[PDB]
Amino acid sequence: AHGGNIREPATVLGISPDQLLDFSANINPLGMPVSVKRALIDNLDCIERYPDADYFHLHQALARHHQVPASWILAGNGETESIFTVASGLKPRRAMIVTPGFAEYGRALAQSGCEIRRWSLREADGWQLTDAILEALTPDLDCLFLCTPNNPTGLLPERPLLQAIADRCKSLNINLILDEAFIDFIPHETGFIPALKDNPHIWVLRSLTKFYAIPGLRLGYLVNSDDAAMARMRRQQMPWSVNALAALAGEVALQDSAWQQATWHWLREEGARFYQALCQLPLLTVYPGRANYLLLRCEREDIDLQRRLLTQRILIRSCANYPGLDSRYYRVAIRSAAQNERLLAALRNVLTGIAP
Amino acid sequence: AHGGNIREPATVLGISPDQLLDFSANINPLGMPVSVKRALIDNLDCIERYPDADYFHLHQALARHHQVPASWILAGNGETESIFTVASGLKPRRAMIVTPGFAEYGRALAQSGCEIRRWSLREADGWQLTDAILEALTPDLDCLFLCTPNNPTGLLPERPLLQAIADRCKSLNINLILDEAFIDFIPHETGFIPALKDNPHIWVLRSLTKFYAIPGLRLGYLVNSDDAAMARMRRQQMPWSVNALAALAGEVALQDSAWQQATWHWLREEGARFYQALCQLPLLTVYPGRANYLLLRCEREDIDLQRRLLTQRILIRSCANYPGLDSRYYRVAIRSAAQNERLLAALRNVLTGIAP
Ligand SMILES: Cc1ncc(COP(=O)(O)O)c(CNC[C@@H](C)OP(=O)(O)O)c1O
Ligand SMILES: Cc1ncc(COP(=O)(O)O)c(CNC[C@@H](C)OP(=O)(O)O)c1O
């Protein structure tokens, strides 16, 4: 049960989803780039033909964007498909995931028949990934999934720690899958694509749906420099999985040279202002997320924050279904100032004026 | 290597794909319904949110269309996804497919770890499915895939034979998967959805991409009346696989009450006129396909028809890669009269004036 389920949320209340303000999914509040919408409208008739099965133009655009060989890239029907593709293409016998984390890594691995080991983040560490994981990495592991920054904490592990993990993985023959779905939101963070050349054991997952606001179109991709392994992924993949409009949108989106700075500026300004306001609320712990969402811990047990905000027609993410987190945890997106203010006001009604 | 690969075909020639006339994919020549295009343009901003994970409106529309419980239906990112979903959801140990047939059944089963048995259609039978298959059906089979009408022959097995197969399957505990991807083109053919109520061993695959001309959007679905099995399919399925525009397009498409009659009329008129003209060509055998495509057998060995037509900038499907068919076999779509005439003229240049 993932976030962004507004139709389901509205159904629970008996109202139309157009009446809900959603903070349970984390999509760039700027909306899709104007050029993207124009291109979609202008080329809509392209849907009367099958997509290019090899997605030449799309992969060329992604390759030019990251300055890597097009052969290192495989686009997917959302990064969600890329996660299932890597799991099925690598068919690990034993794999480690880090909890709490995005639920699909586990679903994908389970379906592929893998023995899943969980590395548990600790509330006492403020949910930060630590070097304690290194000693937990063993030769018998085939894969390790890390999310950078993590869903739902928004925390980004230190580059040196990620490098230490990557190096250990290289020596223990472990494939390292880095989920960089939200990395574009963190100013100046390059991720690991610039370092794949001499590290064929590293796989990077990317998504265009949150940063460019096209989650309804579905577009993500996987990058890796092992010629043979990527070739195998191209087969284990279902044909025409990426729709023609997603491919077009992706190409156009990457051409908007102002999008990145505009998004970073918003995060640095409103995002910082929103975070400060949340931290001024009583009976609430707010974690220092680096992208467009924040993990919250409600210090009032006798209060289902999600149920309470839903009656106020504001949908938030309940993190109780993440392994490792309990009913006190929730996640909210960072949106436009006006919407953020409505969220804040709702939270105050449930948090201010209450004794410990 | 499926048909519709115009970008790849154009690349082989060193030209732009906009210069090719494609007869290698079989899409309704009328294009997408006008209401569908209007709805897509009017609701394009819906892509700024994730699709409804449960696709309520879409499944409700499909259920109303077939007058069956919405619980019997699962939409997919093209019927291609539905094929992979049924294979993975049923995880057959032994399964039978009929050759020649669409390549994805075999790919899907192979990936799921199934022992595949092939029932071979015979050139001496004019590639018709016969009752000889019944004795080949055994208790140890878990699944049987039939395509009605078949890709690439366009032949539709007799209802009584399909019923006999279905009944035998029911008694031998075999799941029967009927690929009805092209059934909408055959006037008055209802398929098996109207008969699923008391046959939970029957699974029907449907596609909206050829009949409504949205192969670039990707939309198909699976129907079955076994409560538990469909429930399992809803899990083995990847979340948000159907994009928001495909779901919208599907709902709108089903509301066009003139589309069906218009398409049937075209097939009965131009389709019949095209078929007759093909049959007047020398050194060519044309099979009696019932939908919008026809299988051709070139009686001139020393002539690669596809290569020869490609130089004339017309792309056709070579069926040499179908198990059971050799280099003499090709398939062509049935399109508009003008385009059909260009195809005919090209064929004449390669077939007329030549001695046996
Ligand atoms: C870390 C992470 N990785 C990959 C994806 C897949 O993205 P896409 O397929 O659109 O490219 C998501 C989406 N997450 C969407 C969100 C609604 O799910 P939760 O409430 O469980 O966080 C994600 O959060
Ligand atoms: C029998 C059959 N079933 C299912 C599909 C999948 O349809 P979709 O995913 O668009 O709903 C196709 C598509 N076939 C497309 C065609 C180009 O492939 P070939 O040249 O191998 O025949 C098909 O021919």
Q: How many CB atoms lie within 10 A of CB B106?
A: 19
Closest by CA to B38, choosing from B182, B233, B252, B309, is B252
Reported structure resolution in angstroms = 1.8
CA A102–ligand 1 middle distance (angstroms): 7
Q: Collapse the DSSP code of B220 into the 3-class scheme (helix H, G, I; strand E, B; otherwise coil) and give the result.
A: strand
What's the angle, vertex CA B35, arms to CA B29 and CA B39, rounded to 5? 120
CB A339 within 8 A of CB A22: no
Q: Residue A343, CB half-sphere, CA atoms under 13 Å: how many?
A: 27
A78 contact residues in B (CB cutoff 8 A)? 240
Identify how many contiguous H helices and E strands chain B contains and give both numbers: 13, 13
CB A118 within 8 A of CB A94: no
The whole-angstrom separation of Cα B39 and Cα B44 is 8
Nearest Cα residue in chain A from B9? A52
Domain ranges of chain B: 2-31+257-356, 32-256
Written as six digits, the tokens of A312 are 């106020």
User: Pocket of ligand 2, candidates B23, B28, B80, B206: which has the most ligand atoms within 8 Å of its Cβ, to mutate?
Assistant: B80
CB A44 within 8 A of CB B41: yes
CB A215 within 8 A of CB A243: no
The whole-angstrom separation of Cα A97 and Cα A183 is 19
The whole-angstrom separation of Cα B45 and Cα B47 is 5
Q: How many CB atoms lie within 10 A of CB A343?
A: 22
Written as six digits, the tokens of A238 are 């279902």
Strand partners, A315: A22
B198 to each of A140, A281, B28, B192, how far by Cα in Å?
49, 59, 33, 11
B77 CB less than 6 Å from ligand 2? no
Torsions phi, psi of A198, nearest 5? Answer: -105, 20
Roughly how many angstroms between the first and final C-alpha of chain B, as a whole number?
A: 32
Burial class for B244, CB neighbours closer than 10 Å (0-12, 13-18, 19+): buried
CB B202 within 8 A of CB B168: no
Closest ligand relative to B180 C-alpha: 2
CB A296 within 8 A of CB A266: no
Written as six digits, the tokens of A300 are 């009032």
Strand partners, B284: B298
Nearest Cα residue in chain B from A110? B236
CB A213 within 8 A of CB A31: yes
Closest by CA to B211, choosing from B197, B198, B221, is B221
In this complex, the residue of A4, A51, A244 whose CB is nearest that of residue B49 is A4
How does DSSP classify residue B51? P
Q: Where are the alpha helices (DSSP H) in chain B?
A: 7-13, 34-42, 56-66, 79-90, 103-111, 132-136, 159-171, 227-236, 244-253, 259-266, 272-279, 305-311, 337-351
B329-333 vs B143-147, strand pairing mode? unpaired
CA B150–ligand 2 middle distance (angstroms): 11
Supply the Cα-derived Rg of chain A in whole angstroms: 20
Closest by CA to B286, choosing from B337, B332, B317, is B332
Q: How many CB atoms lie within 10 A of CB A321?
A: 13
In this complex, the residue of A2, A44, A244 whose CB is nearest that of residue B37 is A44
In this complex, the residue of A37, A48, A236 whose CB is nearest that of residue B32 is A48
Q: Residue B241, CB half-sphere, CA atoms under 13 Å: how many?
A: 27
For residue A249, the one-letter residue type is A
The whole-angstrom separation of Cα B212 and Cα A204 is 37
CA A25–ligand 1 middle distance (angstroms): 8
**Sequence-ordered list of residues with C-beta below 8 angstroms from that of B31, at least 6 positions apart, any chain:** A45, A48, B213
Instruction: Examine residue A187 and say whether the peptide bond preceding it is cis (omega within 30 degrees of 0).
Output: no
- Residue written as tokens 């959801």? B89
The whole-angstrom separation of Cα A332 and Cα A313 is 14
Q: Collapse the DSSP code of A179 into the 3-class scheme (helix H, G, I; strand E, B; otherwise coil) and give the result.
A: strand
H/E stretch holding A163: helix A159-171
Q: Considering all CA atoms of chain A, what is the largest pairwise distance in Å, rounded to the nearest integer?
A: 63
What is the b/e burial string over A64-94, where b = at least 16 CB atoms within 10 angstroms of the residue's CB?
A: ebbebebebbbbbbbbbbbbbbbbbbbebee
Give residues (CB < 6 A) around ligand 1: A 2-4, 25, 78-80, 102-103, 147, 151, 179, 181, 207, 209, 215, 220, 317; B 50
Q: Determine the topology of domain A2-31+257-356 in CATH.
A: Aspartate Aminotransferase, domain 1 (3.90.1150)
How does DSSP classify residue B193? G
The whole-angstrom separation of Cα B157 and Cα B45 is 44
CB A215 within 8 A of CB B47: yes
Instruction: Examine residue A152 and say whether the peptide bond preceding it is cis (omega within 30 degrees of 0).
Output: yes
Closest by CA to B183, choosing from B293, B261, B291, B77, is B291
The whole-angstrom separation of Cα B284 and Cα B274 is 14
Q: Collapse the DSSP code of B221 into the 3-class scheme (helix H, G, I; strand E, B; otherwise coil) and give the result.
A: strand
A347 to each of A246, A313, B100, how far by Cα in Å?
36, 12, 63
How far from chain centre, in Å, is Cα A146?
Answer: 11
The whole-angstrom separation of Cα B30 and Cα B14 is 29
For residue B327, the one-letter residue type is S
Written as six digits, the tokens of A81 are 């498909």
B331 CB less than 6 Å from ligand 2? no
Torsions phi, psi of B115, nearest 5? Answer: -85, 115
**Sequence-ordered list of residues with C-beta below 8 angstroms from that of A176, at least 6 positions apart, any chain:** A143, A144, A146, A165, A166, A169, A201, A202, A203
B88 contact residues in A (CB cutoff 8 A)? 111
Closest by CA to A230, choosing from A71, A50, A59, A30, is A71
Q: Collapse the DSSP code of A56 into the 3-class scheme (helix H, G, I; strand E, B; otherwise coil) and give the result.
A: helix
A293 to each of A220, A305, A308, B193, B246, how far by Cα in Å?
19, 17, 20, 45, 29
CA A66–ligand 1 middle distance (angstroms): 22
Smallest CA–CA distance, residue A177 to chain B, in Å, is 19
The DSSP line for A86-130 is: HHHHH--SEEEEEES--HHHHHHHHHTT-EEEEEEP-GGGTT---
How far from chain centre, in Å, is Cα B264?
Answer: 17
CB B348 within 8 A of CB B281: yes
Cβ pair B215:A78 closer than 8 A: no
* Helix/strand/coil (H/E/C) assignment for every residue in B74-86: EEECCHHHHHHHH
How far from chain centre, in Å, is Cα B163?
Answer: 21
- Residue written as tokens 């990426």? A242
**Sequence-ordered list of residues with C-beta below 8 angstroms from that of B184, at least 6 positions apart, any chain:** B210, B211, B260, B263
The whole-angstrom separation of Cα B48 and Cα B252 is 20
Smallest CA–CA distance, residue A196 to chain B, in Å, is 28
Q: Which CATH class is domain A32-256?
A: alpha beta
Burial class for B173, CB neighbours closer than 10 Å (0-12, 13-18, 19+): exposed
